[PDB]
Amino acid sequence: PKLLLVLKGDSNAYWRQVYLGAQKAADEAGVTLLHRSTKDDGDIAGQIQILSYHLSQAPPDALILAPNSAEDLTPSVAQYRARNIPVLVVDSDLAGDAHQGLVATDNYAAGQLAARALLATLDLSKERNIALLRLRAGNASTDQREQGFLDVLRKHDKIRIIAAPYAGDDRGAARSEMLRLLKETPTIDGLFTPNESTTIGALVAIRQSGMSKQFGFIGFDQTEELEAAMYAGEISNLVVQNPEYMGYLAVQRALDLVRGKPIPAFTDTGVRLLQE
Amino acid sequence: KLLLVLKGDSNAYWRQVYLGAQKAADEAGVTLLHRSTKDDGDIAGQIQILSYHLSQAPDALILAPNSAEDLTPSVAQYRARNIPVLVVDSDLAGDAHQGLVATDNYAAGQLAARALLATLDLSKERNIALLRLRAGNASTDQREQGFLDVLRKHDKIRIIAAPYAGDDRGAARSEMLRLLKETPTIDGLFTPNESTTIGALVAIRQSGMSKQFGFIGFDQTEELEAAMYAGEISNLVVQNPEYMGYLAVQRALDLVRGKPIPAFTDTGVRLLQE
Ligand SMILES: OC[C@H]1O[C@@H](O)[C@H](O)[C@@H]1O
Ligand SMILES: OC[C@H]1O[C@@H](O)[C@H](O)[C@@H]1O
Numbered sequence: 001p002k003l004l005l006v007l008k009g010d011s012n013a014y015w016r017q018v019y020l021g022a023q024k025a026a027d028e029a030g031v032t033l034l035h036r037s038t039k040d041d042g043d044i045a046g047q048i049q050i051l052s053y054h055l056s057q058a059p060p061d062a063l064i065l066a067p068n069s070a071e072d073l074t075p076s077v078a079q080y081r082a083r084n085i086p087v088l089v090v091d092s093d094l095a096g097d098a099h100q101g102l103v104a105t106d107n108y109a110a111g112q113l114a115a116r117a118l119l120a121t122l123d124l125s126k127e128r129n130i131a132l133l134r135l136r137a138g139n140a141s142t143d144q145r146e147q148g149f150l151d152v153l154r155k156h157d158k159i160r161i162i163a164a165p166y167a168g169d170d171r172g173a174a175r176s177e178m179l180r181l182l183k184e185t186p187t188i189d190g191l192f193t194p195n196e197s198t199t200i201g202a203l204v205a206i207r208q209s210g211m212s213k214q215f216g217f218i219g220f221d222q223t224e225e226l227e228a229a230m231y232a233g234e235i236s237n238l239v240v241q242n243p244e245y246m247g248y249l250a251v252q253r254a255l256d257l258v259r260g261k262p263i264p265a266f267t268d269t270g271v272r273l274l275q276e
Numbered sequence: 277k278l279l280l281v282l283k284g285d286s287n288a289y290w291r292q293v294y295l296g297a298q299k300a301a302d303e304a305g306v307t308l309l310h311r312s313t314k315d316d317g318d319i320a321g322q323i324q325i326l327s328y329h330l331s332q333a334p335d336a337l338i339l340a341p342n343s344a345e346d347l348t349p350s351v352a353q354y355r356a357r358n359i360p361v362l363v364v365d366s367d368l369a370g371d372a373h374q375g376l377v378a379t380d381n382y383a384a385g386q387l388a389a390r391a392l393l394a395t396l397d398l399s400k401e402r403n404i405a406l407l408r409l410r411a412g413n414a415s416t417d418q419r420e421q422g423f424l425d426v427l428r429k430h431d432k433i434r435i436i437a438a439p440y441a442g443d444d445r446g447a448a449r450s451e452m453l454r455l456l457k458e459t460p461t462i463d464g465l466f467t468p469n470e471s472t473t474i475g476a477l478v479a480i481r482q483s484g485m486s487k488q489f490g491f492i493g494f495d496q497t498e499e500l501e502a503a504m505y506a507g508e509i510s511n512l513v514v515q516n517p518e519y520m521g522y523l524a525v526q527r528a529l530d531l532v533r534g535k536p537i538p539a540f541t542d543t544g545v546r547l548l549q550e
Contacts (some may be wrong), residue, residue, distance in 0.1 A: 127540065136429070137426075157538065158539070160540055161382070162382060165425035165428070166429045173429075186369065
């Protein structure tokens with residue numbers, strides 16, 4: 001068998017872990033794994049181009065896709081379905097029901113978790129002003145993290161959501177956005193950033209602004225730099241997924257589809273706070 | 277005795293806040309003194325009203341400040357005299373006051389952006405205009421920031437105009453007339469309060485541009501409602517000014533009698549139609 005893996009891009013180190021897990025499973029199975037992603041996360045047009053190119057020029061036995069857009073990728077996936085090529089979605093949900101399954105974090109639950117963690121960092125005897133650094137509307141994973149977070153906090157006594165701008169897919173964009181927020185906002189008491197790039201961008205902005213360790217800060221995903229910032233007390237906690245295990249299971253599920261075996265509609269790959 | 281100082285009388289909106297405050301005051305059997313400037317945005321005039329009442333007299337002040345920063349010294353003077361201050365409608369900078377009763381204006385701006393997006397053909401690039409009110413007026417600054425925060429990075433959306441109109445509907449009319457003449461294409465518009473919405477509406481009609489683009493307005497009056505039902509305005513984001521005035525008085529009475537209040541009481545916001 002041959003499996004085509006198309007992730008969101010290369011703008012997060014996260015994706016290398018998903019790929020490494022997928023490659024481990026493909027190696028164990030004795031199957032060929034192709035990996036083709038856009039340079040940048042969020043490049044919807046580029047991802048659609050990769051899918052159509054491989055459908056025409058070198059079609060796989062199954063497609064494993066992390067869609068950059070929950071809606072804008074459905075026509076691409078429907079083309080695979082009409083060619084009877086199974087599609088397994090990884091990491092971030094796809095709209096509709098053209099695909100055969102999902103293997104991902106429960107991203108809505110991860111956001112609720114992040115809000116609970118933030119509440120635990122705050123002095124809840126006073127009103128607290130909260131900022132959310134959103135990623136990009138239509139990116140299902142972060143849209144769900146953002147909504148789960150807001151659903152815990154919106155009516156919470158002593159909590160005010162004072163900022164929720166979109167940062168975009170780039171850590172440079174997240175840095176620019178956070179720098180503006182820090183300058184323009186009177187008091188930020190708590191922050192949540194829903195992925196690797198937004199967490200790293202915000203961190204760099206917080207340091208450059210002389211604001212380290214000043215407020216509660218829940219981030220998402222982990223790298224050596226984020227782990228260090230957390231151990232230093234610059235980040236209050238990180239909500240972390242299991243990207244290697246997710247990549248590994250996505251390959252196993254895709255192979256089940258190739259062999260005509262049933263798979264769960266949703267395989268939840270787990271989420272946790274990195275520290276107590 | 278409760279002193280109620282709103283922004284001015286440039287918007288029919290303030291009569292609804294006053295009516296709610298008066299209902300609450302009547303129900304509680306307390307005297308309400310409503311004292312506002314003639315025009316919204318008259319910062320110096322509002323400071324004068326506050327200075328006068330400190331010099332000769334109330335048990336609490338309910339204030340809708342014309343400037344989030346410029347009213348802070350006036351409010352601090354009340355705090356130094358231990359007269360509770362409840363801020364209504366539009367936030368005040370600092371922490372000299374005892375609470376806020378208002379729409380969540382930032383969230384209301386985000387709502388307006390989402391409503392505007394729903395009016396647009398998002399298969400194609402769309403040009404968007406925003407009519408700002410006045411820097412330093414917290415309520416509209418927050419609506420504008422919420423709206424922009426949703427849209428500034430949105431695929432296929434370009435913000436091509438964001439001028440300030442000022443507090444008068446006549447000024448909003450002049451500004452919109454200029455935009456309609458000078459801009460090659462406007463695909464969507466947001467106006468963040470009653471005066472800006474009415475001024476834009478009148479300009480759009482006078483330009484022969486009615487029903488040509490998506491238009492989210494803010495606040496409601498019989499005239500704005502008619503325009504919406506006619507399809508001239510796509511939707512209105514509306515506050516609950518009567519409930520806001522009523523709650524502001526009840527919160528002020530709680531302050532007078534020493535019952536703790538929340539720092540922010542969110543009085544709600546919705547789209548007027550589906
Ligand atoms: O979109 C940003 C990507 O970064 C990783 O957190 C996520 O799983 C997500 O899909
Ligand atoms: O400042 C303009 C005033 O008009 C009403 O929309 C508002 O609540 C606002 O404070």
